[PDB]
Amino acid sequence: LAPEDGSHRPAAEPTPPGAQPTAPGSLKAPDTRNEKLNSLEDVRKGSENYALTTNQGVRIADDQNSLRAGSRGPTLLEDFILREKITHFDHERIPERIVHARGSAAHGYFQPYKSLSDITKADFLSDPNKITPVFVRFSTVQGGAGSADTVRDIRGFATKFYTEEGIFDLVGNNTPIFFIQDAHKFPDFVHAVKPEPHWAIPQGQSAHDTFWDYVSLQPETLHNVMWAMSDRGIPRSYRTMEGFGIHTFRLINAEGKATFVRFHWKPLAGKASLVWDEAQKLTGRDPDFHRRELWEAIEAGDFPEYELGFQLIPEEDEFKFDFDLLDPTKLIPEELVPVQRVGKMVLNRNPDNFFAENEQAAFHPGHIVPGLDFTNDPLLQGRLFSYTDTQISRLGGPNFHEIPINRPTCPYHNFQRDGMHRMGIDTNPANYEPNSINDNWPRETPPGPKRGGFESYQERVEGNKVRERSPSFGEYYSHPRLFWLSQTPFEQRHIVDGFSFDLSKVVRPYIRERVVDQLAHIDLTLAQAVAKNLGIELTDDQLNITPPPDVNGLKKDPSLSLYAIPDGDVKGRVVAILLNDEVRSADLLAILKALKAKGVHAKLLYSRMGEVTADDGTVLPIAATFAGAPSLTVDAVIVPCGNIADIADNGDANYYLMEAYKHLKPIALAGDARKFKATIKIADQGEEGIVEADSADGSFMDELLTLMAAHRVWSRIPKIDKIPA
Amino acid sequence: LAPEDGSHRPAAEPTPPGAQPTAPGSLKAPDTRNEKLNSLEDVRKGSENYALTTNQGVRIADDQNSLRAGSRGPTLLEDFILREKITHFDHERIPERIVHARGSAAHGYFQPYKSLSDITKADFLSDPNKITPVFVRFSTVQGGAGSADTVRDIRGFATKFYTEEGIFDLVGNNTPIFFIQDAHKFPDFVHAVKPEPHWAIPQGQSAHDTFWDYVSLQPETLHNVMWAMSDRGIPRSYRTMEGFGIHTFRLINAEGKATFVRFHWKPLAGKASLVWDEAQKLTGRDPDFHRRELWEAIEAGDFPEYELGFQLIPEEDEFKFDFDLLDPTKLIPEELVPVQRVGKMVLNRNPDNFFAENEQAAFHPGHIVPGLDFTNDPLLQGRLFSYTDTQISRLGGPNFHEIPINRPTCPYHNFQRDGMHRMGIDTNPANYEPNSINDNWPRETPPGPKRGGFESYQERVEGNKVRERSPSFGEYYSHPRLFWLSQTPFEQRHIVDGFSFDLSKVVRPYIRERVVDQLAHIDLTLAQAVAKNLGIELTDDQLNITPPPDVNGLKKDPSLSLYAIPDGDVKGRVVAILLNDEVRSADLLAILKALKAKGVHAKLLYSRMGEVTADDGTVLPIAATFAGAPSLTVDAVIVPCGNIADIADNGDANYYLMEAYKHLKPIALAGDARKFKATIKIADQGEEGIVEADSADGSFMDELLTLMAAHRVWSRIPKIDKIPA
């Protein structure tokens, strides 16, 4: 059944996106190893050269047919082979996660830059030569496992560290705050953003009444709403967003000192987002774009890398800010508390089976290790309850830690027994302590500088038993205002556009008005611009609302913008090349090698599949058609010279350019490809963000790569409004 | 928290789409009832004027906060109010259906046109004035419960009939055959179409290697693949598709006579599908399009209506065709066996809670009633095992019939006891029979003409215990060819396009080639047109493969086409009206009056939200912006006159028309709106499919509504290649 030439099989070496069929990671990259990947070997199952069997090991002779009385007769109950095969199929599904149901995962490793023993006894942070295997799952939040990747939403960034002293799960998002203050409200907020209960619409979207109804009645939400309405809400890929733990946690060192910490992930590839029209159209054209992007970067060797960083605050400075450190709706500005680099995480192999490794992974922020501890952040405090509880249904019982991807790689022993799906066969004569019949093994371990038992930091607690929000949490507008003022002008316009779009889908007009009132508490310019888009007029009262105070003297912080401080990086990005039937082969040599030299991938597109032949007879393999792989999926578009008449009349080829133009992407036109300038209305003397020359040689590719480094051509935003695209 | 004017709350009368927020069915249409809807009253839970409580009935004072030791202190374990609330949240999800996970449902009623008691003793078909409540779920097949509606896929059409003599579930699809012959292969086929197991891509799409690998190796699949690749695979609405039971079943009359029968649903709104570009973009712009359209049609009074129809074959004619009646890859052409009309089904109320009624509903083709019976169809035979089995995990146990949506409205009594979540409290002293202690109640009932026990038709069985496919099943090409030749030239082109598009995404080129080889065994013109798009050249041998035989002398059957015989019905369709800031109210009057007379809905669109005022002071609320509700979501576009300069250079307004044009929709341009003819290159003297006049009037509306009756403008196809849209 395989073809003789063995081309059914992907090469076991790094290859760029689209070159080879994708594969299970252990087959694609058998030589990429780590302690966790190695320890999964006992459950990995081959196939080649094995007989097909039942689950009981009985070889199957005919897997095409049910047993029946007569070849046209009824199927017999004694067909155990049929019923086993159908039984397992009938029971394949398990409940999806209540939130972050949609997510894409990979294996990798972490290493600290230096020992952090002065501030934390955490073993995984003790030695730069200690490597910790990780498993990372990125996700959206609202939509089901089957929803689209490039929605507007918060993203989840969850890291499972398999340390020598326990599993540590760092379960964060791509924004430094959350929507709400106390975990008791999580079911209200989530129910409000999720599909509405009567009809289960809309999937993967905040643009509906219930969401904006809740936000309008709960101003503590406005901060994370600002983030989600910005281009933060539509990242280019999981490799180009930030990660944050949100909560203040504690580090505890061997001398018992507690230091407050907020965790950060910095993307080594830089920050980059889509624009809204492109993100939405991409949910239709490739609802798996981020999942795909991740898997292929790893197959290509473009491993996603992230730097772990810590904002660190002395215990004595707990009360030194305008906001409460325990309030998860407040960020800590980096101008006030810098991020200190701690180490590097590299994601470098895909899983083998998505269901087994990704769908069944269980992350929980209560999974800490000696050297870390909690705080009283009332959102974190409730999360600690939820993540253990939900697994009892999602993964079928209390033995979810024995599902292979979840297993510690370090020793685990205790007196816990039984439960559904129990794999470990305990030989301990004792199932209780204290016992004498096994000399009290396994034994408690006192806390200590290394390898000691967990002891909680002895924080003083003092108060009455109350259901009460701290008055210090009662401020809602200054952080939103701070984020707003830190954005570039084009970022601010995209925020205005995000609010305007979402609220336009709110059927009850009074809800729109109520959100607009809330915006007028943040910044009059924002509020007016959204109001104009909604045909709403601010009242004189709303026009006169005093802006909220700066945050400890800050009127902006540029670390809050995606783009204010360029951190571009082109490796792993992709360029569409629009071919014609007589391509100038010199243009193409110059184009492909320049891209290759910077780790930029290329996709050769035409009006059909198969091949075309260049001017000098080079045979050019076609990756996809113009309609099949639209500009949505690339970072820039290059048109080499040749017989342009071949495609000049192709509506798809023209539309390819107009869509890429509208979404602010670098375009380069060589030789007669400048005839396309008329489609995108480009002036004779040229325009910034359009590379043009007689040929693809000299500075042509360097100028294109310079545009790609800056991600998008923001200066084009005034010009795109005329284009009907 | 509600506004002053009561306008938080939807009018409880029929209203057009967008006029009111959508609502739970019993609040929207409280006067719409049937025996099943009434019987759900014991579990309906209101809310107005009630106190907020725990599930144990304890009133909550503060639903905003966890219990903590001091207002910035840790959350306490004794907070049972938080933990019940979070526990319930943490366990909301249940396993989605293995297949048909994505779906949308409604209540309604069925009734036969005349008594069928000469051919069946089934009670629900016995009396033209006896009404049977139904609950219908429409679905896709491949994607998850959060995947998009307007994918290319087969659709499911499952009807639960709550009869006086038992639940009958008629569990069909929107094409008259399935992909495979024997149930034993179902996990192989479904796994091949589903997302691939390494990376869980792609969602909701057949366009990937594993699917086309299976197809190319299993030519029995080609017939349903033809239907999937045609515009059947992308219906406009669940109201405008056909439904079929696929299998041959039996009708058994009071005298014991068996008649073989295939079941049909005929949509009274006519057959109508999208075009591919539109359908794929619509998965991004509104992934809930079909769910929404169905809910809104019901809210508006455009109740979906279907005619049940039977193809009837006497028992002595079982072998008289050149295909096997028991082969679910073969259709019975209506030219050979006509569909007899049987009754009418009306869907007239939406559910109250999607999860409780739609997600928990359980349909199963084994749920038959006396007067129906099965056949030896080897696909149907294995389905009977799977639907009972799968419910055990999906719905948590064997008491799934006690979940309120699934409960029979007729009596049910037996000796079965216990099981998880047992609701029924049995008083019977006996739990076994035979018993004396309850005088053997409840008792067996002998079979008879009405109110009788179920007895299987005593079919003769003769053969050895074999796992063997019937030789009569081993023909794969003649039904694909019949379907091909029965399609109009534009439908054939769209089929070619669908194959070409899917296969272009297959990475392994030998798989494309093998599928083209298969096409060459169906029809050369089809094989060559697919080959050309793939840059593949047919071999001499392939050009010489003899066409498969006609199906019992048939060279075409026009009933297999969506469009060859007009049957268009505009009621419930929708028109976009592109507003300007000085709308000519005389045009608007004439438009809305003619639309209203045919039950066609309108949406008023503009370049922002809020209101515009017409030339006569009429205040017009704006339903959506041009960008926010694209032409994808309407059936036609009208541009009234007025201040055209307002929108004449708006890129979104121009693009709206270019998109609707590309997708073959009727466009009407009044007065100066005729200037837009420029963006779409219409001849001065006009074009069939573009309605133009000095004003919108009687004749102008007529022309537009005639075009809408014909669904799309197929004659414009040659012209859409040039437009860059």
Ligand code: HDD
């Ligand atoms: C008390 C309820 C609750 C609250 C207040 C939070 N979550 Fe959570 N979260 C859950 C209850 C939960 C959960 C129900 O327990 C999930 C779903 C399924 C699972 O395994 O854990 C979950 C999943 C989940 C995942 C997916 C993990 C994975 O990939 O499997 C991420 C990344 C987060 N959450 C992160 C957050 C962040 C950054 C929060 C605010 C700071 C947050 N959660 C608040």
Ligand code: HDD
């Ligand atoms: C032997 C396995 C098997 C085979 C051969 C089939 N199916 Fe099936 N089908 C299932 C096993 C199944 C299932 C696993 O049992 C589902 C999923 C969960 C459930 O409740 O039923 C299902 C669900 C399902 C639904 C969704 C009902 C709902 O909305 O809940 C429809 C409409 C169909 N099927 C129709 C078909 C048709 C028309 C088939 C071929 C003629 C077919 N199935 C072959």
